[PDB]
Amino acid sequence: XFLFX
Amino acid sequence: XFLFX
Amino acid sequence: GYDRHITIFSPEGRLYQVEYAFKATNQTNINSLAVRGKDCTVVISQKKVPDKLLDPTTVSYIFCISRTIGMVVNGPIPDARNAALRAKAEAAEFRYKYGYDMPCDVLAKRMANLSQIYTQRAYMRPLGVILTFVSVDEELGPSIYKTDPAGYYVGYKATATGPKQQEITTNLENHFKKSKIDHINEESWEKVVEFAITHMIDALGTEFSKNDLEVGVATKDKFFTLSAENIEERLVAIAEQ
Amino acid sequence: SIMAVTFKDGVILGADSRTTTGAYIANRVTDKLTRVHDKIWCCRSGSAADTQAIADIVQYHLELYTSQYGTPSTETAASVFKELCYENKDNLTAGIIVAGYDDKNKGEVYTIPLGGSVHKLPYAIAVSGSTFIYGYCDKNFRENMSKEETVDFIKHSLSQAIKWDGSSGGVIRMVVLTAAGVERLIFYPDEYEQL
Amino acid sequence: NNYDGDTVTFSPTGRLFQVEYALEAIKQGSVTVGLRSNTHAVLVALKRNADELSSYQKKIIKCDEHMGLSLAGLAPDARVLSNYLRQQCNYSSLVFNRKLAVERAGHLLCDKAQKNTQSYGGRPYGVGLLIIGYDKSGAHLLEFQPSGNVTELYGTAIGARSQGAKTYLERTLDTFIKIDGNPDELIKAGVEAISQSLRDESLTVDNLSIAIVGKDTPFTIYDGEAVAKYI
Amino acid sequence: TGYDLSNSVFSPDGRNFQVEYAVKAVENGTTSIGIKCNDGVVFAVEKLITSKLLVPQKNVKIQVVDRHIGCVYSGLIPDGRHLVNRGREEAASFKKLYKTPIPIPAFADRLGQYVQAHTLYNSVRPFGVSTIFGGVDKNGAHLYMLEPSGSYWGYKGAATGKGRQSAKAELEKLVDHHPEGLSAREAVKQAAKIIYLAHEDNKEKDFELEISWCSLSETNGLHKFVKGDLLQEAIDFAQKEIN
Amino acid sequence: TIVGVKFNNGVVIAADTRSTQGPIVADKNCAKLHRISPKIWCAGAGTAADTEAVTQLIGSNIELHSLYTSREPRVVSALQMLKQHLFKYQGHIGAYLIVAGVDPTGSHLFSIHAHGSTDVGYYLSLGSGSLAAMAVLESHWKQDLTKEEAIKLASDAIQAGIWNDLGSGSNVDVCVMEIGKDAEYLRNYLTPNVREEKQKSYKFPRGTTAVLKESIVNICD
Amino acid sequence: GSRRYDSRTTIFSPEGRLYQVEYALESISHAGTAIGIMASDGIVLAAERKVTSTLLEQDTSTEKLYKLNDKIAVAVAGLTADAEILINTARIHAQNYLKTYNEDIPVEILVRRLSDIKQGYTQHGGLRPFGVSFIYAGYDDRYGYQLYTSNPSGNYTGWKAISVGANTSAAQTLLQMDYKDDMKVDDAIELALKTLSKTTDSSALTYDRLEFATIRKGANDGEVYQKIFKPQEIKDILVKTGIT
Amino acid sequence: MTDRYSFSLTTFSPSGKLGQIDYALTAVKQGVTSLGIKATNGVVIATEKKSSSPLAMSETLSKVSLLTPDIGAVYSGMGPDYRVLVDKSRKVAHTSYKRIYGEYPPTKLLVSEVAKIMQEATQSGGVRPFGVSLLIAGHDEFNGFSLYQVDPSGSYFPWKATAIGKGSVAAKTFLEKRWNDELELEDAIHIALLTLKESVEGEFNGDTIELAIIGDENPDLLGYTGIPTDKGPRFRKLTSQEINDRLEAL
Amino acid sequence: MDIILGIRVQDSVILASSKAVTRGISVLKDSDDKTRQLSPHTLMSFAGEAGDTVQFAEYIQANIQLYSIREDYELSPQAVSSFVRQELAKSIRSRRPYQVNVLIGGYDKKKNKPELYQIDYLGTKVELPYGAHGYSGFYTFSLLDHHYRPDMTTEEGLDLLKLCVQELEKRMPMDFKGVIVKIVDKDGIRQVDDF
Amino acid sequence: SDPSSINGGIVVAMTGKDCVAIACDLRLGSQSLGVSNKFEKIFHYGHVFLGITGLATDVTTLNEMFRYKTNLYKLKEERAIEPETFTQLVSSSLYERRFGPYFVGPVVAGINSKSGKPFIAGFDLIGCIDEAKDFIVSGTASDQLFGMCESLYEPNLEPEDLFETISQALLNAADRDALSGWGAVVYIIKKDEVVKRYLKMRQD
Ligand SMILES: [Cl-]
Ligand SMILES: [Cl-]
Ligand SMILES: [Cl-]
Ligand SMILES: [Mg+2]
Ligand SMILES: [Mg+2]
């Protein structure tokens, strides 16, 4: 896998 | 993780 | 003619059950009046206690919906209390969900939308009540919004409801033609109540004792009803002028 | 570290300002004293999320109660808190102290600990993540104490907790509930540390 | 007339005609008598046959060891209400280790009958019941009507020509109330009572139905050769 | 027309004829009264002795709600029982959430909203009872009377049933002759008298008197039935007044 | 790295522009600043899909609420709706948001955690770079900041995250919400990480790749 | 209760007819005429718009002719609103079949299911039936070019040429007179227009009062094209056949 | 208790008429006149503000409603029925389109969804049809400007220009004479004000007339800057002052 | 339920399926037919979890037989395979998934072409000249990659399958008690009586 | 037991001057076993191209799903869906299955028929959008593709040049991944023509 700042 | 005195 | 028994269209495009719900409005034979000040909104209603056995403190058609919103009802007390409990529930739920006090006009719209459903759904009858919502809104200032069994609602500079509504309406109309403004140019709410009572006396042609009237006042961040003694003090001021 | 103390004129609520994630202080100026009614307030310990969700619901119930039945008792507020804490004990980690002022009943303090039980006490102190202390200087507390004495008593008690503990810290916030109204007090570290 | 279509409609004089029509089913039903002393409570029932080849419709239903009723009107409705009473008697035993009070039995029947007189689609019950029992406050006799009205009585009768037996019990009140620790004599008074509601037909061995409950007597029903003694 | 055949239908007048028809059932019922006193309320009811065969004292019509509220009604007795059952659920759910026993005004609206709900749909029948109820709460003594429409008000004295006009007249005299207030023990005796006077409108069958009361001083704020010596003292007082 | 800074006549929120799959930078220039409403903006950290979805859903419901009430939406409404939604899912929706905006009440700055806790602050930081950002905010924040001072402080706090946090990088996005003015969204406000010229061009001689088959694709009706 | 106000929409007459179905068909008989004609090399759909106004936007309008998929269209006669409910259902059923089998839905299967929905409203639910008759024009690899009609009863039948709505009696006699089995699409176009031109309640048949569509194999090699005619394309075909 | 009305209150009469739809249209006929005109570079929708009382504040009651930034709606008939339809229309624009495609629906498709809600009130159990006709004016990138009428039946038709309610027959005749395919937006507003003066009897000014346009994008009404693709709403409600300015040169 | 093979030749599809049914350390049966006829020109072989295999096969058989009666038409092998895949693709996110792997061999009478489809328990569909499920593929795929020619006849295809079965008997640890071989061509489905 | 790396395979998309390119390998495996060398991972709905890597059953299921949704879109809207709008639909549809997700890495490629602007986008399995000027990568050799693309890619390449760049990016990435290869397809997409080329690569 997921996109994750 | 979660916030928690 | 079963088109007169439920909320379906008659051949001439009318809803008779809605029209008859309006006639139920005047069953109590009580007249209400609402006006706006600079800082306040005042609502006055006739108080009639015919039975001697009644506890007069419990005989009221003015309800405290929220802490800022007040609501006077013209119609039978069962339907009045039905509308009151629902409005109280709706105002509380709004504050919980959206994190700010429900505005007077938004509650009015919500109750009007509920009233509209009763005119379109057959199993539910319309409530035989006209709801007059008053507050000092934090955005719009002094506010009067009135709902009816048709699901109609609108804002008012001032308004009147009941059997002798037309007489009170024209009395207020004539004042606003003269004053040339949308409100009662008065600092204190005490003098706005004195105006409301004075113009009801002139319109109906009847005098009032402390027990013949019921008064609700909306200020910034609270709506409250006056006691018999609060009204009596107010009636003395009118008489001494 | 949170506590509520009943005194002559009403009741004082006090707490620290520190919110922790692991050893990181997420908020060093947290307001742990929460209004559920004009003169009914609560101290929140345990999960920040859980205590906020509960306090928001209790405030809704008391607002609705006030509309229908007029001003509610502190006991009523405590009952609503317990109901939410007891029925949802499996999914909740909230320790709450309820403090309120009635003109009839004066200052009342109720504690809802992790169990979801309710206890009415003259005063309550919870430290180290919702650990209520019995005793806690019972000789140090007397009934019908003065407002200044109560403020001094809570200020000292919380100061000692902050000193020994790392969970507690920042400023000391207090709320005074009396017939007069609501007063908010704040004490900065430089004042309370030299105690 | 216009106001008897359903149970959800009042008449202009404030009557519920569907309930009044249900009450009429009871008057058509065969006579049954109830009476009690301080020690015992008795049910006497005149059973009705379709013809000489048929059996005689059973009128008396056991609800617990300490309680049962006799019926007059729609038998299937008596089965529904008696089954409900059995469950409430049973609930009381299992949950509270407590024999259900005859008064509470009455209150529960009343509230069940009432719901069927206020809701559209449903109908009122078409049966009257005489409930007898012995609980912690001694002997009891109840009269149930499907209007929901339940009444505690020393004696009564329901069904066709019930007025005859009801008049007798009203006269005999002072005599039969004091028949304490004597079952047979209290039944005899019940059989002499139901005899005042007979026309042409008399009490035979397979016609008469008796039930009794008391201090040291579980609710037992007597039929056939067992009621020959009382003819 | 046909506006009276279905519940929740407005007539051209703006009336619900089915509710007005339910009132006729109430007017047909036995007399029941309520008297508000210094520190509580008194309830009394007329029980018609249809037959010698009725067991005296063992057909109780007055019902308790929670421990502090009394309820009496005239009309369809089963409809009254249905309403009290609902009242007990409402009082239980209030006490469960808010701890405090339900205030009388709070309780009054709970019955009010429920009865009013039975005038909103044609699938239901209005209640065929007027209910006189009340008790003692934190704010003192409260007496209410609730009608098939859902309409209710606070009362100093209340009456409903066949002998209501007689009872109302006798209640109006008490209010006038006792402006500073009536005591609990007095109200019990007066209640007995008014039922005996109201029995003149129902004098074919003889009757049995039944009284209950809630008083902060006499019953400690709880609902109790008037029995034994105090009941016989009230009957004797009423017997002396008719003669 | 996302920050909120309150100033005299409004609130300013800033964010970095790095999106990651494990240790890989998936997007060198992604937008973490969301418009909930014209004058209510959101900075999102945590699960990228969750922050976008939760911001769009509340934004949609706020727009409908605004039409119904005929009023400009309030930040507390967005805050209340977000926290109740996030609480319901018990932290399974991994959205950590900084909510700032101007409404008729005034200017507001809030933070929301995935479990549904909210705080109020004059300056807030969230994400992996929160500690680097907060160090700058704690060092340089003062009461009665001007707009120019608030933008500089916010961008400096993001820079701290970009340089010192491996999770944060690329450019700085700022949104300025001032009372009585249109919210101004400064996309790529700073671009301090520009790829240097490549030493060589990897453009291939045409025909370098071996082809088995060719065909024309029909995309028309 | 509510029993008093129930029309009982799903009961038999003493003669064994369905009241609401019969009255729905009476409704449809007042609707603009729709004609389908099936040729050896395509299908024509022609429909008459209900008394057009001069200020009605003709070019961006859809009243009579709707696309179900790339191979199936319908001509509507009755309540447009009712038709659109059923059309969206049919469009979904077609895509459900394509998703399941990776094959375009055979015409009859789509027709049967849409017809079975109408049937349901006549046997249970206590609701009014759909006041709609459809002409289905479609192509599949099994039966080739197919014309069907369905009506509120849920009954459907196959046709070489058919009309629904107003003046079907007159229209069916004219089609039965001039139709033959070895007919071409261009011939079927001329027949459809000539039939409407004679049955129409209007003074003269013009482009602005018509919707027109053809399903041909006019595209290159074994593929079907659906042509929903533009206003200018109707104007041209109306001059070419010599009606204006 | 419970909704026992699970059967249709709208049925076919022996003549094939749907009574309740016919009667709904009669209610629309009694309604106050509203109209719509489509120009080359915009669309105008207008109606009279029939004030129930002079004490009432006619500003609070909005007969012309924004549905999306590029779509507006006006009505003739029962106001309350319109108000709940606007609420349902705004919601369905989000739930069944914007939350799926991330853009507002085109005019024809939102109209289609409103039509569907009104068709359901025609067939569903225990409900009467909506007693309103809607005029929905809108713009979208691929269809440009468009004007649609929606009737109680659920039927909708696209119009170059039309009118509904009290004086619709006369109003439609007036529009037929004045309308051409070369009309600029200002010309269509002028014609709209001329057309509406015929049907209005009492006072005719910016306080008794409600008028909105679908025209050019309004950056000033967007509420934010920084996204070049977001250029602002095409729907604009004309002010009391803006209407009075165009009544002088009439 | 171990060995299921499939070879698509010029004019037919050949399915080979192991005859052994084993539970524990006992071979319960040595004559088991791990195939169902879906339609006159479509055959499905299956292998996986006990019970699930036959239950799934018979369920598919019933649904295709129902379609055949309703439409008086034989669904194409492509259509049957697409239906079967969708049923398995539903199964994998069910409470209890079908653990069944299938080969679908069919002759398409419209195209006059044999077709072999390989679908695993996840609903992973692929069209192949030959295929297998389980550990059989590990030996047979490389063998078929060598000796398979696309224009082979049924007799050539059977000899190629014998080579596959002989390799499996030599190198596979378990005894699968030989294979039942079925040919699907334009004339329908027939079983090779001796193998 | 990691859904995304059972079947294996890769997709890469790139923008050029008035053109986009999308490419994929043809391998479908069951872990170590190669099953099919004809498993195309690129589908098109009108002029919008969708590549999908990950669990093959979900690749097939999502293709069937987006065909369904775009077919209904075209019937109602009366026009083919655009890349920008289709991207939002993929995002919506994936996040609908947030707590039971499709194990896929979809890639959108196409030219807006109105503006003529080249468009590419990528998604995670729960539908977060990665919009990029340069290139998008997906699959078991995503790390390898990121390396190739970041070094080989330059802006505003002509169709004939862009073909060479994306081809070399895919081929050299697939050769360093065990679960990718077994053939490759490259789509070169211009405003009103689309060429599809099969690449010769090592079959191991
Ligand atoms: Cl109130
Ligand atoms: Cl609403
Ligand atoms: Cl907190
Ligand atoms: Mg109705
Ligand atoms: Mg490789």
Coordinates of N, CA, C and O in Angstrom, one line a residue, chain I residues 131-202:
Chain I
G131 N -46.4 16.6 -6.6 CA -47.3 17.6 -7.3 C -46.5 18.8 -7.8 O -46.9 19.9 -7.5
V132 N -45.4 18.5 -8.5 CA -44.5 19.6 -9.1 C -44.1 19.2 -10.5 O -44.0 18.0 -10.8
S133 N -43.9 20.2 -11.4 CA -43.1 20.1 -12.6 C -41.8 20.9 -12.4 O -41.9 22.0 -12.0
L134 N -40.6 20.3 -12.7 CA -39.3 21.0 -12.6 C -38.8 21.4 -14.0 O -39.1 20.7 -15.0
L135 N -38.2 22.6 -14.1 CA -37.3 23.0 -15.2 C -35.9 23.0 -14.6 O -35.6 23.7 -13.6
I136 N -35.0 22.1 -15.2 CA -33.6 22.0 -14.8 C -32.7 22.5 -16.0 O -32.7 21.8 -17.0
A137 N -32.0 23.6 -15.7 CA -31.0 24.2 -16.6 C -29.6 23.7 -16.2 O -29.4 23.8 -15.0
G138 N -28.7 23.4 -17.1 CA -27.4 22.9 -16.8 C -26.4 23.0 -17.9 O -26.8 23.2 -19.1
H139 N -25.1 22.9 -17.6 CA -24.0 22.8 -18.6 C -23.1 21.6 -18.2 O -23.0 21.3 -17.0
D140 N -22.5 20.9 -19.2 CA -21.5 19.9 -19.0 C -20.6 19.9 -20.3 O -21.1 20.2 -21.4
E141 N -19.3 19.5 -20.2 CA -18.3 19.7 -21.2 C -18.7 19.1 -22.5 O -18.4 19.8 -23.5
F142 N -19.3 18.0 -22.5 CA -19.5 17.1 -23.8 C -20.9 17.4 -24.4 O -21.0 17.0 -25.6
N143 N -21.9 17.9 -23.6 CA -23.2 18.2 -24.1 C -23.5 19.7 -24.3 O -24.5 20.1 -24.9
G144 N -22.6 20.5 -23.6 CA -22.8 22.0 -23.6 C -24.0 22.4 -22.8 O -24.3 21.6 -21.8
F145 N -24.7 23.5 -23.1 CA -25.9 24.0 -22.4 C -27.1 23.2 -22.8 O -27.2 22.8 -23.9
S146 N -28.0 23.0 -21.8 CA -29.3 22.2 -22.0 C -30.3 22.6 -21.0 O -30.0 23.0 -19.8
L147 N -31.6 22.5 -21.3 CA -32.8 22.8 -20.5 C -33.8 21.6 -20.6 O -34.2 21.3 -21.7
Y148 N -34.2 21.1 -19.4 CA -35.1 19.9 -19.3 C -36.3 20.2 -18.5 O -36.2 20.9 -17.5
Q149 N -37.5 19.8 -18.9 CA -38.7 19.7 -18.1 C -38.9 18.3 -17.5 O -38.7 17.4 -18.3
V150 N -39.3 18.2 -16.2 CA -39.6 16.9 -15.6 C -41.1 17.0 -15.0 O -41.3 18.0 -14.2
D151 N -41.9 16.0 -15.3 CA -43.4 16.0 -14.9 C -43.6 15.0 -13.8 O -42.8 14.1 -13.6
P152 N -44.7 15.1 -13.0 CA -45.1 14.1 -12.0 C -45.0 12.6 -12.3 O -44.7 11.8 -11.5
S153 N -45.3 12.3 -13.6 CA -45.2 10.9 -14.2 C -43.8 10.4 -14.1 O -43.7 9.2 -14.0
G154 N -42.8 11.3 -14.1 CA -41.4 10.9 -14.2 C -40.8 11.2 -15.6 O -39.6 10.9 -15.8
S155 N -41.7 11.6 -16.6 CA -41.3 11.9 -18.0 C -40.5 13.2 -18.0 O -40.8 14.1 -17.2
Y156 N -39.5 13.3 -18.8 CA -38.7 14.5 -19.1 C -38.4 14.7 -20.6 O -38.4 13.7 -21.3
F157 N -38.4 16.0 -21.0 CA -38.2 16.4 -22.4 C -37.2 17.5 -22.4 O -37.2 18.4 -21.5
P158 N -36.3 17.6 -23.4 CA -35.4 18.7 -23.6 C -36.1 19.8 -24.4 O -36.8 19.5 -25.3
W159 N -35.9 21.1 -24.0 CA -36.5 22.3 -24.5 C -35.5 23.3 -25.0 O -34.5 23.5 -24.3
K160 N -35.7 24.0 -26.1 CA -35.0 25.2 -26.5 C -35.5 26.4 -25.6 O -34.6 27.1 -25.1
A161 N -36.8 26.4 -25.3 CA -37.4 27.3 -24.3 C -38.8 26.8 -24.0 O -39.4 26.1 -24.9
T162 N -39.3 27.0 -22.8 CA -40.7 26.6 -22.3 C -41.1 27.3 -21.1 O -40.3 28.1 -20.5
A163 N -42.3 27.1 -20.7 CA -42.9 27.6 -19.4 C -43.9 26.6 -18.9 O -44.4 25.8 -19.7
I164 N -44.1 26.6 -17.5 CA -45.0 25.7 -16.8 C -45.8 26.5 -15.8 O -45.3 27.6 -15.4
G165 N -47.0 26.0 -15.4 CA -47.8 26.6 -14.3 C -48.9 27.4 -14.9 O -49.4 27.2 -16.0
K166 N -49.3 28.5 -14.2 CA -50.6 29.3 -14.3 C -50.7 29.7 -15.8 O -51.7 29.2 -16.4
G167 N -49.8 30.5 -16.3 CA -49.9 31.2 -17.7 C -49.0 30.6 -18.7 O -48.5 31.4 -19.5
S168 N -48.8 29.3 -18.7 CA -47.8 28.5 -19.5 C -48.3 28.6 -21.0 O -47.4 28.8 -21.8
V169 N -49.5 28.4 -21.2 CA -50.1 28.3 -22.6 C -49.7 29.6 -23.4 O -49.2 29.5 -24.5
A170 N -50.0 30.8 -22.8 CA -49.8 32.1 -23.3 C -48.2 32.3 -23.4 O -47.8 32.9 -24.4
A171 N -47.5 32.0 -22.3 CA -46.1 32.2 -22.1 C -45.3 31.4 -23.3 O -44.4 32.0 -23.8
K172 N -45.7 30.2 -23.6 CA -45.1 29.3 -24.6 C -45.3 30.0 -26.0 O -44.3 29.9 -26.8
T173 N -46.5 30.5 -26.3 CA -46.8 31.2 -27.5 C -45.8 32.4 -27.7 O -45.3 32.6 -28.8
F174 N -45.6 33.2 -26.6 CA -44.7 34.4 -26.6 C -43.3 34.0 -26.9 O -42.6 34.7 -27.7
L175 N -42.8 32.9 -26.3 CA -41.4 32.4 -26.5 C -41.2 31.9 -27.9 O -40.1 32.1 -28.5
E176 N -42.2 31.2 -28.5 CA -42.2 30.7 -29.9 C -41.8 31.9 -30.9 O -41.0 31.7 -31.8
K177 N -42.5 33.1 -30.7 CA -42.3 34.3 -31.6 C -40.9 34.8 -31.4 O -40.3 35.2 -32.4
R178 N -40.4 34.9 -30.2 CA -39.1 35.6 -29.8 C -37.9 34.7 -30.0 O -36.8 35.3 -30.3
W179 N -38.0 33.4 -29.8 CA -36.8 32.5 -29.7 C -36.2 32.3 -31.1 O -37.0 31.9 -32.1
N180 N -34.9 32.4 -31.3 CA -34.1 32.0 -32.5 C -32.8 31.3 -32.0 O -32.6 31.3 -30.7
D181 N -32.1 30.6 -32.9 CA -30.9 29.8 -32.5 C -29.6 30.7 -32.4 O -28.5 30.1 -32.2
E182 N -29.7 32.0 -32.6 CA -28.6 32.9 -32.6 C -28.6 33.8 -31.3 O -27.8 34.8 -31.2
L183 N -29.5 33.5 -30.3 CA -29.7 34.3 -29.1 C -28.5 34.3 -28.2 O -28.0 33.2 -27.9
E184 N -28.0 35.4 -27.8 CA -26.9 35.6 -26.8 C -27.6 35.5 -25.4 O -28.9 35.6 -25.4
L185 N -26.9 35.4 -24.3 CA -27.5 35.1 -23.0 C -28.3 36.4 -22.5 O -29.4 36.2 -22.0
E186 N -27.7 37.6 -22.7 CA -28.4 38.9 -22.3 C -29.7 39.0 -23.0 O -30.7 39.4 -22.4
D187 N -29.8 38.6 -24.3 CA -31.0 38.6 -25.1 C -32.1 37.7 -24.5 O -33.3 38.1 -24.4
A188 N -31.7 36.5 -24.1 CA -32.5 35.4 -23.4 C -33.1 35.9 -22.1 O -34.3 35.6 -21.8
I189 N -32.3 36.6 -21.3 CA -32.7 37.3 -20.0 C -33.7 38.3 -20.3 O -34.7 38.3 -19.6
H190 N -33.5 39.2 -21.3 CA -34.4 40.2 -21.7 C -35.8 39.6 -22.1 O -36.8 40.1 -21.6
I191 N -35.8 38.6 -22.9 CA -37.0 37.8 -23.4 C -37.7 37.2 -22.1 O -39.0 37.3 -22.1
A192 N -36.9 36.6 -21.2 CA -37.4 35.9 -20.0 C -38.2 37.0 -19.2 O -39.3 36.6 -18.7
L193 N -37.7 38.2 -19.0 CA -38.3 39.3 -18.2 C -39.6 39.7 -18.9 O -40.6 40.0 -18.2
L194 N -39.6 39.9 -20.2 CA -40.8 40.3 -21.1 C -41.8 39.2 -20.9 O -43.0 39.6 -20.6
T195 N -41.5 37.9 -21.1 CA -42.4 36.8 -21.0 C -43.1 36.7 -19.6 O -44.3 36.4 -19.5
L196 N -42.3 36.9 -18.5 CA -42.8 36.8 -17.1 C -43.7 37.9 -16.7 O -44.5 37.7 -15.8
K197 N -43.5 39.1 -17.3 CA -44.3 40.3 -17.0 C -45.8 40.1 -17.4 O -46.6 40.6 -16.7
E198 N -46.0 39.3 -18.4 CA -47.4 38.9 -18.9 C -48.1 38.1 -17.8 O -49.3 38.4 -17.6
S199 N -47.5 37.2 -17.2 CA -48.1 36.2 -16.2 C -48.1 36.8 -14.8 O -49.0 36.4 -14.0
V200 N -47.3 37.8 -14.5 CA -47.3 38.5 -13.2 C -48.3 39.6 -13.2 O -48.4 40.3 -14.2
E201 N -49.1 39.7 -12.2 CA -50.2 40.7 -12.1 C -49.9 41.9 -11.2 O -50.1 43.1 -11.6
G202 N -49.3 41.6 -10.0 CA -48.9 42.7 -9.0 C -47.6 43.4 -9.3 O -47.4 43.7 -10.5

